[PDB]
């Protein structure tokens, strides 16, 4: 919580130097994602928490911004749509319909 205090303080400045530490130490994929996706935009940065700390829908912000390509149907599942059984399945249909991309989302945990 002390780190989160310094996080709010430096956020008022704007330097995400170690505020990501301030967040993830406080177990904030929330604040990590807010700051990085807001500025860093690094898929690896958010994917850190996404693939080792189970970041929920904060990763989904990254995909919400990065789902603007033909092969980004993987991106919709690259971040796993958080917990989603048909959101990413609607996205798989959505290309025109993408059965190949649907089974691509079926690379591990197709649908639930």
Curated annotation (Swiss-Prot):
Repeat (TPR) residue spans along the chain: 1-33, 56-89
Species for this entry: Homo sapiens (Human)
Reported function: As component of the IFT complex A (IFT-A), a complex required for retrograde ciliary transport and entry into cilia of G protein-coupled receptors (GPCRs), it is involved in cilia function and/or assembly. Essential for functional IFT-A assembly and ciliary entry of GPCRs. Associates with the BBSome complex to mediate ciliary transport.
Protein name: WD repeat-containing protein 19
Tissue: Some isoforms are tissue-specific. Highly expressed in the prostate. Lower expression in the cerebellum, pituitary gland, fetal lung, and pancreas. In normal prostate, expressed in both basal and luminal epithelial cells. No expression detected in fibromuscular stromal cells, endothelial cells, or infiltrating lymphocytes. Uniformed expression in prostate adenocarcinoma cells.
Inducing or repressing factors: By androgenic hormones. Expression increased 3-fold in an androgen-stimulated androgen-sensitive prostate adenocarcinoma cell line compared with androgen-deprived cells.
Entry's localization field: Cell projection, Cilium; Cytoplasm, Cytoskeleton, Cilium basal body; Cell projection, Cilium, Photoreceptor outer segment; Cell projection, Cilium, Flagellum
Source taxon at top rank: Eukaryota
Subunit field text: Component of the IFT complex A (IFT-A) complex. IFT-A complex is divided into a core subcomplex composed of IFT122:IFT140:WDR19 which is associated with TULP3 and a peripheral subcomplex composed of IFT43:WDR35:TTC21B. Interacts (via C-terminal region) with IFT122 (via C-terminal region). Interacts with BBS1. Interacts with TTC25.
Disease field: Cranioectodermal dysplasia 4: A disorder primarily characterized by craniofacial, skeletal and ectodermal abnormalities. Clinical features include craniosynostosis, narrow rib cage, short limbs, brachydactyly, hypoplastic and widely spaced teeth, sparse hair, skin laxity and abnormal nails. Nephronophthisis leading to progressive renal failure, hepatic fibrosis, heart defects, and retinitis pigmentosa have also been described. Short-rib thoracic dysplasia 5 with or without polydactyly: A form of short-rib thoracic dysplasia, a group of autosomal recessive ciliopathies that are characterized by a constricted thoracic cage, short ribs, shortened tubular bones, and a 'trident' appearance of the acetabular roof. Polydactyly is variably present. Non-skeletal involvement can include cleft lip/palate as well as anomalies of major organs such as the brain, eye, heart, kidneys, liver, pancreas, intestines, and genitalia.
């Amino acid at each position: 919580k002390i780190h989160l205090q310094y996080a709010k303080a430096k956020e008022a400045d704007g330097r995400y130097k170690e505020a990501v530490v301030a967040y993830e130490n406080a177990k904030q994929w929330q604040s990590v994602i807010r700051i990085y996706l807001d500025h860093l935009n690094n898929p690896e940065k958010a994917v850190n928490i996404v693939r080792e700390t189970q970041s929920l829908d904060g990763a989904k912000m990254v995909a919400r911004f990065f789902l603007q390509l033909g092969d980004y149907g993987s991106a919709i599942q690259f971040l796993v749509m958080s917990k989603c059984n048909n959101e990413a399945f609607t996205l798989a249909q959505q290309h025109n319909k993408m059965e190949i991309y649907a089974d691509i989302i079926g690379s591990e945990d197709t649908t639930n």
